[PDB]
A = this chain, B = another copy of it.
Amino acid sequence: RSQTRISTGSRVQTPAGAIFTVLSDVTIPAGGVATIDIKSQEYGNIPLPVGNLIIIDGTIGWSGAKVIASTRVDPGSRQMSDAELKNARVNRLAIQGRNSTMAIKAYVSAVPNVTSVNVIENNTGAVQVVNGVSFTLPYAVWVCVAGNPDKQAVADALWAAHNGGTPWDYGATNNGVPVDGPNGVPVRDPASGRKYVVKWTTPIMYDGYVNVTVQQGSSSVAPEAIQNAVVNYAQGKVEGEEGLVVGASLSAFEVAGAIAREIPGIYIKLCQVACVAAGSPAPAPGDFTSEYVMSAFGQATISVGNVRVTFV
């Protein structure tokens, strides 16, 4: 009790968290208080809830732990975007607009931690199916949002780009994944009146694989620089070719092209891909084909180990 914690108190998590105390606190006679703190740099590894170590402090300071009741926020960094900004330019080319499918896509992309989005307007309203994904209502806009943003912020953005009298259709069972099932996020209208409802969906997770046959020709050796190129292309760091997005489809020819632009002179022979659901084991060599349809709803992901390269 009655101990004042000085500013810039060090606090290291077990995998070298290196968190800093930003504001000073005073311990009340109860013996347990609450402090706020920040990560030292751009990146902070996820702190497992343990008793945080005390490095720099006063004389009395005993210990400090972490509980799930504590709050969090997820960083996003690394130009951010450097050369995929050229890709994002064509997507968010209508940020300054509102009340349109393109403006909706642009704004919901401008939300942080939104890797990709898909928007369907289904404007010839007769229920039916338009451009994939069935629609219960005649006129309704369906939004598939990848990434892991905050529901509140993305809901605010979706309401900001509202279009007026278009509902949000996200049903058809398997079509997407409902974010909160029926009766989605309420959000509040900035023009004060009622708590509305905005419905968007999350794409179905898919796990992809790649089998490559290369010759290692031209006297240029590269044992495991292939999967790095494949994963870079999948994540979208290449210029002009967006990676595995909601509307994307895992294509052997695209994987081959990315591999070649990263390193030429290997004479790629086979680039079978195939893909499975979020779980499931490896799809066996029988499944490895040249393409996957990869319907509009759904996002594929290529792990670092899911690419296997063979020298011939």
Chain A residues with CB under 8 Å of chain B are 1-2, 10, 12, 14, 16-18, 28-29, 52-53, 55
Contact = CB atoms under 8 A, between A and B. Distances in A.
A47 to B, nearest CB: 14
A48 to B, nearest CB: 12
Contact of A2 (B2, B12, B14, B29): B12
A52 B31 CA distance: 13
A62 to B, nearest CB: 15
Q: Within the oligomer, what is the number of copies of this chain?
A: 3
Contacts of A16: 28-29
Contacts of A53: 1, 29
Contact of A1 (B1, B28, B29, B55): B55
5 contacts: A1-B55, A2-B12, A12-B29, A16-B29, A29-B53
Contacts of A12: 1-2, 29
A60 to B, nearest CB: 10
Given A16-B28, A16-B29, 12 more contacts: A1-B12, A1-B53, A1-B55, A2-B10, A2-B12, A2-B18, A2-B55, A12-B29, A14-B29, A17-B29, A29-B52, A29-B53
A14 B18 CA distance: 36
Contacts of A14: 29
Contacts of A29: 12, 14, 16-17, 52-53
A14 B52 CA distance: 29
Contacts of A17: 29
Q: Which 5 A-B pairs have the closest CB atoms?
A: A12-B29, A29-B53, A2-B55, A2-B12, A1-B12
A43 B16 CA distance: 40
A2 B29 CA distance: 28
Contacts of A1: 12, 53, 55
Nearest to A10: B2
Contacts of A28: 16
Nearest to A28: B16
Nearest to A13: B29
Interface centre among A10, A17, A29, A52 (most CB of B within 10 A): A29
A16 B17 CA distance: 35
A1 B52 CA distance: 12
A10 B52 CA distance: 29
A54 to B, nearest CB: 10
Nearest to A55: B2
A23 to B, nearest CB: 20
A50 B16 CA distance: 30
Contacts of A52: 29
Contacts of A18: 2
Nearest to A12: B29
Nearest to A3: B55
A52 B29 CA distance: 10
A17 B17 CA distance: 37
